[PDB]
Amino acid sequence: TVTEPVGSYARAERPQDFEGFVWRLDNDGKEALPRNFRTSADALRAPEKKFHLDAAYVPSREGMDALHISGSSAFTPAQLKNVAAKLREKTAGPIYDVDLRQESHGYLDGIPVSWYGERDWANLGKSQHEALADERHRLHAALHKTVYIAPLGKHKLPEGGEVRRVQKVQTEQEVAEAAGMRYFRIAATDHVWPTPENIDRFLAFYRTLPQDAWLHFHSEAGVGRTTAFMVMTDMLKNPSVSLKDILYRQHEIGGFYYGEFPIKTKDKDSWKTKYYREKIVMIEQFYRYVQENRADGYQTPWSVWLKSHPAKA
Amino acid sequence: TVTEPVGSYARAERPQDFEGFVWRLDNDGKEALPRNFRTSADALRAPEKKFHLDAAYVPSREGMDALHISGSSAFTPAQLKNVAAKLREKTAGPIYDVDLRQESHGYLDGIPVSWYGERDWANLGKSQHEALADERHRLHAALHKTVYIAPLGKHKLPEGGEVRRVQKVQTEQEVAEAAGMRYFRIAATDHVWPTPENIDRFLAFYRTLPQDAWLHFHSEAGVGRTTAFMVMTDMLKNPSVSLKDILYRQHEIGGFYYGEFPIKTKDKDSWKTKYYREKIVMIEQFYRYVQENRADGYQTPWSVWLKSHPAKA
Ligand SMILES: O=P(O)(O)O[C@@H]1[C@H](O)[C@H](O)[C@@H](OP(=O)(O)O)[C@H](OP(=O)(O)O)[C@H]1O
Ligand SMILES: O=P(O)(O)O[C@@H]1[C@H](O)[C@H](O)[C@@H](OP(=O)(O)O)[C@H](OP(=O)(O)O)[C@H]1O
Ligand SMILES: [Cl-]
């Protein structure tokens, strides 16, 4: 009777309506660091107004000093070494660049770009294998070819930018390993809740980690996907902390807020409304997964548990 | 000794530096007519101040009534039908759409676009054969594909525009024949003086026209290349008219002035300067070709004559 369960709404959208049409500039490389850079060691600041939170609530910091995670937006290669260098002061563990982007991206002549389709959905519906093969094929195709690279402006369309003939092409994995970071890819679709596949892959990965591993999450802006995986990591590693505290603290170090709040979008942005609501419900559902399955050591994965414990809108 | 004779400066430029990167919007289709629409039967207007001409000068109209030519910018299909209907009111002869554009262009869902490279030079150096081959391959490749079409804005780079999955592809040949016009293509490079190859093709074409043929020339903006062939036609068919009159009258009906004038360029447009100067010289040289070959019936092709009678800087 149910075509798309809650948590899988994006499956109803049609990928053929969002195919990539331009190399989008992911970071202009002007600053020393990527945007929205934050670490779990950072001091808590006031909530953003739009979330209508209790400014005076002080969330527990239980486990934060030990969390060892960070988040950021996309970066140039120089910016990533600066990140790696900053993080290397805080740990002697391996540092992972955890790349949460389903969209095909890489570096053309050291410039960080992505193949941008409407809503950033150019790889919508593809398996991780298919997404990455596309990415590799496209990047290789750009070498010694003329390309147009532009930032998005008015109404999410190209505005200015530049044209060049590319002399070097790199994957983010190459750039990460050049900055001394290990690399882990989770192909998560922009704007929406990560898929069961996304999270099963993340959970098995998390399970292989040495104790002193530091996880640096990033996506395009370092907001939606980055925060979702920061929050999930926090819940997994610190299961005795309350839902509310996890969400308050991940927001107040510079993340998105993943609890209820009054959503009011502009008209041309109202397609986002139900995707926000979906993420809120799924955040609660993941919390529940952790509480019920951590005891036995996660004998049953998220994808399976969720099919027998469907979320409700 | 001499690497590139006058008339062939553009041959020294390197094609690989101007390769196409975007589907440019050739006309937004808001007006009923293309821009710079004019006919050889129009009233003369005041010259443009930037050319510092004698506004009191009354050029001879000898032969203009019989000249039967027109010019305009690029157009949508509906705009072309409007052009064809207006011209049909002036003549009962065959009406020609003379397409002077070297750049690859056509129509996607009826939208006039072109494959734009910097300086509009994406087909620089190609034979007319190779250029049309590029055009056919690109137009066809766009069918059922997602494309980005954009007007150029600041600094000749894409600004805004639209994204669509293309359901229909046509050549300008198709669009012209659909509007009741005969089609003739001369692949002339934007900004520069037409090659001897271009001019030879046009002269052989001119020599096969019925007496009542009406030539509608057009290029991207209907200024540079369009005026050059309107002027050439005026000289071939009205050989007894003075260089000065021709140039004055072709400007005063709405064309470019192809005589000497104080060139005032911007900085980012100083690359233009020598190409303007080249054209003024080659215009005079063509006139000389007309005068010296009007008598033996144009036995001698422009390209061979020009090689023995090279023009000087
Ligand atoms: O790429 P990430 O790190 O997942 O972050 C998202 C990304 O920057 C999107 O482009 C953005 O959409 P908009 O440009 O439409 O804001 C979205 O904001 P929103 O969904 O909160 O608007 C972010 O959450
Ligand atoms: O396509 P056509 O009819 O040959 O007309 C030319 C075309 O519009 C060029 O883009 C334009 O250069 P700009 O974009 O630099 O103006 C040039 O003007 P200019 O060479 O007089 O500047 C025109 O002559
Ligand atoms: Cl199971």
XYZ file of C-alpha atoms and ligand atoms in Angstrom:
675
model
C 0.000 0.000 0.000
C 2.869 2.532 0.629
C 4.994 3.591 -2.380
C 7.730 5.594 -0.619
C 8.136 5.206 3.149
C 9.085 8.237 5.270
C 12.840 8.771 4.896
C 12.748 7.936 1.204
C 10.634 10.782 -0.212
C 13.346 11.810 -2.668
C 12.847 8.516 -4.495
C 9.624 9.932 -5.923
C 11.460 12.732 -7.776
C 12.546 12.128 -11.402
C 16.331 12.178 -11.984
C 15.973 12.949 -15.667
C 14.570 16.360 -14.654
C 17.790 17.386 -12.838
C 20.689 16.369 -15.091
C 23.969 18.293 -14.712
C 24.612 21.250 -17.006
C 27.580 23.232 -15.622
C 30.850 22.966 -13.667
C 29.995 24.875 -10.533
C 32.689 26.590 -8.509
C 32.541 25.030 -5.035
C 34.941 27.482 -3.332
C 36.610 30.677 -4.637
C 39.707 29.924 -2.584
C 39.857 33.425 -1.088
C 39.871 32.462 2.604
C 42.463 30.341 4.434
C 39.839 27.808 5.510
C 36.553 26.438 4.127
C 33.258 27.985 5.210
C 31.432 26.849 8.326
C 34.512 25.161 9.728
C 33.889 23.772 13.208
C 35.148 21.170 15.639
C 33.565 19.263 18.527
C 36.041 20.951 20.858
C 34.669 24.371 20.015
C 32.850 26.620 22.487
C 29.057 26.784 22.297
C 27.513 29.985 21.072
C 23.972 31.323 20.914
C 21.385 29.559 18.734
C 20.453 31.175 15.431
C 17.165 33.117 15.713
C 15.387 31.238 12.926
C 15.278 28.055 15.005
C 13.413 29.655 17.940
C 15.358 27.792 20.567
C 15.878 28.483 24.286
C 18.926 30.778 24.306
C 19.482 30.049 28.007
C 19.506 26.265 27.827
C 22.972 24.854 28.404
C 23.301 21.397 26.862
C 25.414 18.679 28.423
C 28.975 18.494 27.145
C 29.241 14.855 28.206
C 31.558 13.200 25.708
C 32.265 16.218 23.502
C 35.950 16.482 24.332
C 36.316 12.874 23.183
C 34.050 13.096 20.139
C 36.836 14.188 17.752
C 34.804 15.336 14.756
C 34.697 18.404 12.585
C 32.686 19.770 9.671
C 33.122 22.188 6.814
C 32.079 23.200 3.358
C 33.940 22.358 0.208
C 37.550 23.555 -0.076
C 40.464 24.153 -2.388
C 43.492 21.900 -1.870
C 45.348 24.652 -0.022
C 42.372 25.099 2.248
C 42.330 21.368 2.983
C 45.999 21.291 4.143
C 45.219 24.177 6.392
C 42.367 22.128 7.821
C 44.528 19.030 8.136
C 47.238 21.067 9.860
C 44.738 22.598 12.302
C 43.295 19.154 13.098
C 46.729 17.544 13.427
C 47.358 19.771 16.467
C 44.447 18.115 18.220
C 45.215 14.489 17.502
C 47.716 11.783 16.685
C 45.038 9.534 15.227
C 44.319 9.085 11.582
C 42.318 11.987 10.140
C 39.589 11.097 7.679
C 38.148 13.440 5.093
C 34.587 12.089 4.986
C 33.160 13.303 1.722
C 29.366 13.261 1.901
C 28.598 14.464 -1.619
C 26.635 12.367 -4.117
C 27.267 14.984 -6.795
C 30.261 14.427 -9.070
C 33.107 16.704 -8.044
C 36.851 17.057 -8.195
C 39.528 19.549 -9.046
C 40.344 21.053 -12.403
C 43.735 22.829 -12.235
C 43.335 22.787 -8.440
C 39.951 24.470 -8.628
C 37.227 22.617 -6.693
C 34.221 22.070 -8.966
C 31.058 19.957 -9.161
C 28.842 18.927 -12.042
C 25.743 20.921 -11.126
C 22.187 20.000 -12.025
C 19.049 21.685 -10.790
C 18.667 21.347 -7.034
C 22.184 19.864 -7.113
C 20.585 16.578 -8.099
C 22.629 15.513 -11.143
C 23.332 12.063 -9.633
C 19.887 11.614 -8.102
C 18.876 7.940 -7.995
C 22.287 6.558 -8.940
C 24.006 3.963 -6.816
C 27.232 5.042 -5.176
C 29.058 2.924 -7.762
C 27.263 4.637 -10.649
C 27.779 8.103 -9.153
C 31.512 7.612 -8.738
C 31.960 6.141 -12.224
C 30.309 9.133 -13.663
C 32.477 11.437 -11.613
C 35.658 9.678 -12.746
C 34.569 9.645 -16.413
C 33.598 13.328 -16.403
C 36.793 14.438 -14.686
C 38.961 12.537 -17.162
C 36.951 14.006 -20.063
C 37.789 17.527 -18.933
C 41.578 17.092 -19.226
C 43.084 19.208 -22.024
C 39.570 20.371 -22.846
C 38.015 23.787 -22.679
C 35.628 24.191 -19.752
C 33.396 26.829 -18.274
C 33.486 27.185 -14.483
C 31.082 29.465 -12.700
C 29.582 30.343 -9.387
C 25.831 30.252 -9.096
C 24.130 33.561 -8.448
C 20.723 34.973 -9.194
C 18.271 32.069 -9.040
C 20.840 29.285 -8.887
C 22.137 29.896 -12.413
C 25.704 30.648 -13.612
C 26.922 34.194 -13.277
C 30.306 35.226 -14.642
C 32.960 32.601 -13.884
C 35.805 31.723 -16.241
C 36.873 29.601 -19.163
C 40.024 27.561 -19.258
C 41.680 24.684 -20.917
C 42.368 22.172 -18.179
C 45.932 20.898 -17.708
C 45.380 18.854 -14.585
C 42.510 16.874 -13.146
C 42.243 15.332 -9.674
C 39.746 13.425 -7.512
C 39.068 14.572 -3.987
C 40.644 11.343 -2.775
C 43.926 12.353 -4.424
C 43.685 15.831 -2.836
C 42.868 14.407 0.591
C 45.725 11.880 0.596
C 48.008 14.745 -0.499
C 46.995 16.641 2.613
C 47.738 13.575 4.724
C 44.151 12.584 5.273
C 42.478 9.223 4.790
C 39.408 9.405 2.548
C 35.944 7.994 2.901
C 33.113 8.628 0.466
C 29.400 8.535 1.234
C 27.306 9.552 -1.769
C 24.537 11.506 -0.049
C 22.012 13.518 -2.041
C 21.922 17.257 -1.429
C 18.927 18.755 0.533
C 17.398 15.513 1.787
C 17.750 12.862 4.465
C 20.553 10.399 3.772
C 19.353 7.050 2.403
C 19.355 3.684 4.240
C 22.257 2.643 2.022
C 24.163 5.854 2.942
C 23.708 5.178 6.652
C 24.438 1.411 6.519
C 27.705 2.260 4.759
C 28.452 4.936 7.340
C 27.666 2.570 10.225
C 29.932 -0.224 9.040
C 32.691 2.318 8.443
C 32.218 3.798 11.927
C 32.583 0.305 13.279
C 36.059 -0.157 11.781
C 37.492 3.012 13.330
C 40.428 3.006 15.696
C 39.710 4.860 18.925
C 41.753 7.925 18.075
C 40.282 8.410 14.612
C 39.299 11.996 13.809
C 36.429 12.428 11.370
C 36.235 15.534 9.229
C 32.855 15.675 7.490
C 32.202 17.946 4.588
C 29.579 18.520 1.937
C 28.998 21.523 -0.356
C 28.045 24.135 2.222
C 28.879 22.193 5.332
C 25.325 22.543 6.600
C 22.720 19.922 5.668
C 24.599 16.669 5.136
C 27.618 17.604 7.225
C 25.467 18.281 10.295
C 23.334 15.187 9.848
C 26.386 12.941 10.000
C 27.959 14.889 12.828
C 24.748 14.364 14.818
C 24.614 10.662 13.990
C 28.227 10.203 15.036
C 27.522 12.067 18.295
C 24.568 9.747 19.057
C 26.476 6.584 18.280
C 29.510 7.494 20.316
C 27.633 9.239 23.163
C 24.393 7.176 23.555
C 23.654 8.310 27.129
C 23.249 11.949 26.032
C 19.691 13.194 25.424
C 18.305 13.814 21.964
C 17.784 17.456 22.852
C 21.381 17.993 24.026
C 22.873 16.336 20.917
C 20.871 18.677 18.648
C 21.435 21.847 20.698
C 25.210 21.281 20.909
C 25.737 20.273 17.258
C 23.886 23.402 16.259
C 25.668 25.747 18.672
C 29.162 24.774 17.526
C 28.157 25.958 14.041
C 25.855 23.311 12.628
C 22.294 23.111 11.421
C 19.579 22.500 14.011
C 17.872 19.172 13.422
C 14.949 19.436 15.904
C 11.473 20.900 15.367
C 11.294 24.548 14.508
C 8.860 26.875 12.704
C 9.623 26.490 8.999
C 8.793 29.443 6.776
C 10.240 29.393 3.262
C 10.151 31.824 0.361
C 7.742 30.762 -2.418
C 10.362 29.515 -4.900
C 11.870 27.455 -2.050
C 8.742 25.691 -0.769
C 9.790 22.377 -2.303
C 12.155 22.151 0.637
C 9.447 22.209 3.275
C 8.611 18.482 3.345
C 12.315 17.536 3.173
C 13.026 19.482 6.345
C 10.095 17.773 8.033
C 11.356 14.379 6.833
C 14.819 14.980 8.307
C 13.352 15.914 11.669
C 11.355 12.708 11.895
C 14.284 10.583 10.692
C 16.617 12.164 13.229
C 14.306 10.937 16.021
C 14.131 7.516 14.294
C 17.931 7.144 14.182
C 18.143 8.084 17.852
C 15.684 5.290 18.543
C 17.739 2.881 16.387
C 20.782 3.594 18.545
C 18.972 3.119 21.847
C 17.415 -0.193 20.807
C 20.365 -1.767 19.006
C 23.552 -0.623 20.738
C 23.194 -3.206 23.551
C 23.625 -6.211 21.254
C 26.305 -4.429 19.213
C 24.149 -3.604 16.162
C 23.381 -7.184 15.076
C 20.717 -5.708 12.765
C 21.577 -2.793 10.473
C 19.694 0.446 10.020
C 18.169 -0.387 6.636
C 16.605 -3.577 8.029
C 15.523 -2.177 11.378
C 13.832 0.774 9.665
C 11.712 -1.386 7.356
C 10.247 -3.145 10.409
C 9.988 0.116 12.410
C 8.733 2.591 9.863
C 8.827 6.283 10.788
C 5.617 8.318 10.812
C 5.078 11.793 9.365
C 59.075 36.695 -46.222
C 55.446 37.651 -45.319
C 53.640 35.229 -43.011
C 50.088 36.632 -43.148
C 49.064 39.132 -45.806
C 46.708 41.968 -45.066
C 43.195 40.541 -45.148
C 44.340 37.407 -43.335
C 45.540 38.673 -39.939
C 43.107 36.437 -38.023
C 45.021 33.446 -39.377
C 47.781 34.169 -36.844
C 45.454 33.574 -33.904
C 45.266 30.111 -32.319
C 41.921 28.278 -32.571
C 42.554 26.109 -29.502
C 42.382 29.276 -27.401
C 38.798 30.117 -28.420
C 36.974 26.784 -28.253
C 33.250 26.750 -27.601
C 31.948 26.477 -24.042
C 28.228 27.433 -23.985
C 24.993 27.665 -25.928
C 24.529 31.368 -26.331
C 21.083 32.932 -26.703
C 21.087 34.692 -30.092
C 17.748 36.408 -29.674
C 15.261 36.584 -26.775
C 12.407 36.607 -29.274
C 10.504 39.464 -27.622
C 10.388 41.737 -30.673
C 8.419 40.990 -33.842
C 11.546 41.640 -35.894
C 15.260 40.960 -35.513
C 17.509 43.859 -34.514
C 19.057 46.195 -37.053
C 16.531 45.228 -39.688
C 16.949 47.293 -42.844
C 16.470 47.219 -46.596
C 18.084 48.926 -49.551
C 14.778 50.700 -50.156
C 14.731 52.467 -46.791
C 15.029 56.230 -46.347
C 18.466 57.495 -45.276
C 18.914 58.701 -41.689
C 21.453 60.882 -39.959
C 24.884 59.244 -39.623
C 26.080 58.123 -36.202
C 28.205 60.686 -34.392
C 30.971 58.236 -33.553
C 31.930 58.003 -37.220
C 32.449 61.787 -37.520
C 30.873 62.041 -40.976
C 29.473 64.970 -42.979
C 25.791 64.995 -41.905
C 25.084 67.515 -44.689
C 26.300 65.124 -47.348
C 23.568 63.772 -49.599
C 24.767 60.463 -51.074
C 23.536 59.343 -54.455
C 20.654 56.837 -54.368
C 21.573 55.591 -57.840
C 20.660 51.923 -58.083
C 19.283 51.517 -54.588
C 15.709 50.956 -55.793
C 16.909 47.970 -57.825
C 19.511 46.707 -55.326
C 17.063 44.415 -53.471
C 19.014 43.493 -50.331
C 18.417 43.638 -46.576
C 20.197 42.889 -43.299
C 19.493 41.939 -39.713
C 20.641 40.254 -36.572
C 19.918 36.628 -35.797
C 16.271 35.753 -35.276
C 13.734 33.308 -33.863
C 11.640 31.321 -36.327
C 8.608 33.596 -35.792
C 10.807 36.652 -36.379
C 12.072 35.207 -39.655
C 8.546 34.566 -40.947
C 7.826 38.199 -40.151
C 10.913 39.240 -42.135
C 9.939 37.027 -45.075
C 6.405 38.493 -45.160
C 7.741 42.061 -45.199
C 10.207 41.289 -47.995
C 7.540 39.456 -50.010
C 5.708 42.787 -50.230
C 8.652 44.250 -52.117
C 9.473 41.489 -54.533
C 8.130 38.551 -56.495
C 11.569 37.010 -56.894
C 13.240 34.360 -54.798
C 14.139 35.596 -51.318
C 17.437 34.410 -49.890
C 18.425 33.976 -46.310
C 22.178 34.557 -46.582
C 23.648 33.212 -43.368
C 27.068 34.762 -42.797
C 27.896 33.054 -39.491
C 30.957 30.777 -39.142
C 29.974 29.941 -35.580
C 27.840 26.797 -35.154
C 24.249 27.741 -34.618
C 20.717 26.431 -34.928
C 17.538 26.013 -32.932
C 16.712 23.980 -29.881
C 12.998 23.878 -29.153
C 12.784 26.808 -31.609
C 15.232 28.884 -29.573
C 18.037 30.496 -31.636
C 21.358 29.478 -30.108
C 25.040 29.319 -31.019
C 28.067 27.439 -29.681
C 29.971 30.339 -28.228
C 33.718 30.435 -27.664
C 35.584 33.538 -26.513
C 35.428 36.348 -29.095
C 32.716 34.250 -30.773
C 35.596 32.272 -32.329
C 34.635 28.623 -31.690
C 35.052 27.664 -35.363
C 38.067 29.865 -36.134
C 40.319 28.298 -38.760
C 37.937 25.543 -39.865
C 36.935 25.002 -43.498
C 33.313 25.809 -44.157
C 32.919 22.024 -44.512
C 34.415 21.333 -41.071
C 32.429 24.097 -39.430
C 29.086 22.857 -40.734
C 30.127 19.364 -39.692
C 30.737 20.606 -36.155
C 27.352 22.372 -36.255
C 25.464 19.263 -37.405
C 27.117 17.036 -34.794
C 26.455 19.428 -31.919
C 22.854 20.198 -32.830
C 22.066 16.522 -33.135
C 23.891 15.701 -29.893
C 21.579 18.085 -28.047
C 18.366 16.193 -28.880
C 16.834 14.667 -25.727
C 19.720 16.048 -23.696
C 19.718 18.638 -20.941
C 21.235 21.920 -22.102
C 22.014 25.343 -20.592
C 21.134 28.341 -22.775
C 22.206 31.795 -21.664
C 22.511 35.366 -22.861
C 25.947 36.908 -22.445
C 26.323 39.629 -19.872
C 29.233 41.127 -17.995
C 32.485 40.505 -19.857
C 30.984 38.175 -22.457
C 30.217 35.421 -19.974
C 26.908 33.650 -19.286
C 24.406 35.390 -17.088
C 21.185 33.755 -15.986
C 19.449 31.967 -18.847
C 17.589 28.670 -18.660
C 17.966 24.912 -18.496
C 15.865 22.511 -20.554
C 15.673 19.002 -21.938
C 15.572 19.531 -25.690
C 12.718 17.964 -27.631
C 13.450 19.506 -31.027
C 16.501 20.414 -33.065
C 16.632 22.271 -36.380
C 19.228 23.893 -38.579
C 18.821 27.408 -39.881
C 18.436 25.858 -43.299
C 15.288 24.116 -42.062
C 14.004 27.262 -40.425
C 14.651 29.344 -43.526
C 12.990 26.879 -45.921
C 10.061 26.693 -43.514
C 9.678 30.472 -43.826
C 9.649 30.411 -47.635
C 13.283 31.490 -48.089
C 16.126 29.995 -50.060
C 19.210 29.373 -47.928
C 22.785 30.234 -48.614
C 25.581 29.864 -46.080
C 28.831 31.797 -45.974
C 30.874 30.783 -42.913
C 32.453 34.133 -41.940
C 34.366 34.640 -38.727
C 32.953 37.226 -36.276
C 34.858 40.538 -35.884
C 37.135 40.103 -38.885
C 37.281 40.737 -42.622
C 35.838 37.791 -44.561
C 38.439 35.391 -45.897
C 39.244 35.210 -49.586
C 37.487 31.822 -49.437
C 34.322 33.410 -48.071
C 34.361 36.123 -50.718
C 35.042 33.710 -53.604
C 32.027 31.630 -52.568
C 29.865 34.732 -52.375
C 30.995 35.996 -55.817
C 30.294 32.656 -57.512
C 26.905 32.713 -55.725
C 26.189 36.251 -56.811
C 26.941 35.363 -60.414
C 24.200 32.699 -60.492
C 21.367 34.797 -59.082
C 18.225 35.609 -61.043
C 17.793 39.269 -61.696
C 14.951 39.626 -59.196
C 16.603 37.753 -56.309
C 16.400 39.494 -52.950
C 19.309 38.861 -50.611
C 18.639 38.999 -46.885
C 22.034 38.912 -45.197
C 22.331 38.268 -41.506
C 24.939 37.581 -38.833
C 24.782 37.638 -35.004
C 24.092 41.318 -34.471
C 23.672 42.323 -38.095
C 26.396 44.925 -37.891
C 29.910 43.804 -38.815
C 29.666 40.920 -41.231
C 26.201 41.859 -42.497
C 27.192 45.376 -43.561
C 30.365 44.100 -45.217
C 28.394 41.873 -47.581
C 25.672 44.490 -48.149
C 28.452 46.904 -49.143
C 30.162 44.334 -51.367
C 26.831 43.624 -53.072
C 26.170 47.300 -53.593
C 29.570 47.658 -55.300
C 29.189 44.656 -57.582
C 25.747 45.703 -58.789
C 26.298 49.485 -58.844
C 29.970 49.688 -60.012
C 29.660 53.253 -61.289
C 28.734 54.578 -57.817
C 31.505 56.187 -55.742
C 33.163 54.381 -52.848
C 32.101 57.270 -50.648
C 28.413 57.121 -51.627
C 28.173 53.369 -51.174
C 29.730 53.534 -47.732
C 27.680 56.519 -46.690
C 24.371 55.053 -47.904
C 24.941 51.572 -46.406
C 25.613 53.227 -43.068
C 22.733 55.661 -43.230
C 20.109 52.927 -43.867
C 21.261 51.310 -40.581
C 24.584 49.626 -41.274
C 28.146 49.998 -40.061
C 30.286 52.727 -41.663
C 33.190 51.010 -43.424
C 35.282 54.089 -44.194
C 38.054 55.645 -42.154
C 36.980 56.964 -38.759
C 38.568 57.777 -35.420
C 38.614 54.365 -33.773
C 37.925 54.723 -30.034
C 38.192 51.361 -28.250
C 38.051 50.331 -24.624
C 40.997 48.568 -22.990
C 39.484 45.089 -22.952
C 38.601 45.705 -26.632
C 41.969 46.891 -28.002
C 42.392 43.536 -29.731
C 39.608 44.878 -32.120
C 41.584 47.835 -33.282
C 43.773 46.280 -35.966
C 40.795 44.311 -37.287
C 38.840 47.527 -37.816
C 41.830 48.947 -39.681
C 42.218 45.822 -41.750
C 38.559 46.043 -42.848
C 38.781 49.654 -43.981
C 41.744 48.703 -46.144
C 40.149 45.552 -47.575
C 36.924 47.448 -48.325
C 38.893 49.847 -50.518
C 40.747 46.947 -52.042
C 37.503 45.150 -52.934
C 36.255 48.302 -54.674
C 39.468 48.226 -56.666
C 38.807 44.633 -57.564
C 35.317 45.580 -58.752
C 36.482 48.502 -60.913
C 39.263 46.477 -62.520
C 37.192 43.387 -63.221
C 33.695 44.747 -63.902
C 34.728 44.888 -67.573
C 35.970 41.364 -68.329
C 32.928 40.041 -66.457
C 34.685 39.094 -63.192
C 36.663 36.450 -64.983
C 39.226 36.625 -62.229
C 38.486 35.249 -58.755
C 38.983 37.644 -55.823
C 41.383 35.298 -54.126
C 43.840 35.137 -57.058
C 43.645 38.837 -57.873
C 44.257 39.727 -54.207
C 47.383 37.497 -54.188
C 48.884 39.490 -57.113
C 47.494 42.756 -55.925
C 48.039 42.525 -52.196
C 46.621 45.397 -50.104
C 48.934 47.392 -47.816
C 48.765 48.339 -44.116
O 25.641 20.965 0.794
P 25.266 20.778 2.253
O 26.421 20.895 3.209
O 24.343 19.626 2.506
O 24.363 22.079 2.572
C 23.248 22.412 1.745
C 23.729 23.057 0.459
O 24.538 24.183 0.763
C 22.557 23.513 -0.404
O 23.036 24.187 -1.576
C 21.633 24.449 0.365
O 20.505 24.782 -0.447
P 20.082 26.320 -0.680
O 21.183 26.885 -1.538
O 18.750 26.224 -1.381
O 20.046 26.897 0.712
C 21.148 23.814 1.663
O 20.438 24.790 2.423
P 18.883 24.683 2.829
O 18.385 23.351 2.297
O 18.957 24.839 4.337
O 18.322 25.886 2.102
C 22.325 23.341 2.512
O 21.835 22.678 3.683
O 27.722 39.355 -35.755
P 27.966 40.562 -36.625
O 26.747 41.060 -37.352
O 29.190 40.444 -37.488
O 28.261 41.767 -35.602
C 29.361 41.774 -34.694
C 29.023 40.974 -33.443
O 27.801 41.451 -32.893
C 30.126 41.083 -32.398
O 29.760 40.339 -31.232
C 30.368 42.529 -32.021
O 31.450 42.598 -31.100
P 31.252 43.196 -29.615
O 30.486 42.123 -28.886
O 32.656 43.398 -29.117
O 30.482 44.469 -29.827
C 30.716 43.353 -33.251
O 30.785 44.722 -32.872
P 32.185 45.513 -32.855
O 33.198 44.563 -33.459
O 31.869 46.740 -33.688
O 32.438 45.775 -31.385
C 29.675 43.222 -34.348
O 30.147 43.885 -35.523
Cl 19.057 -8.639 10.208
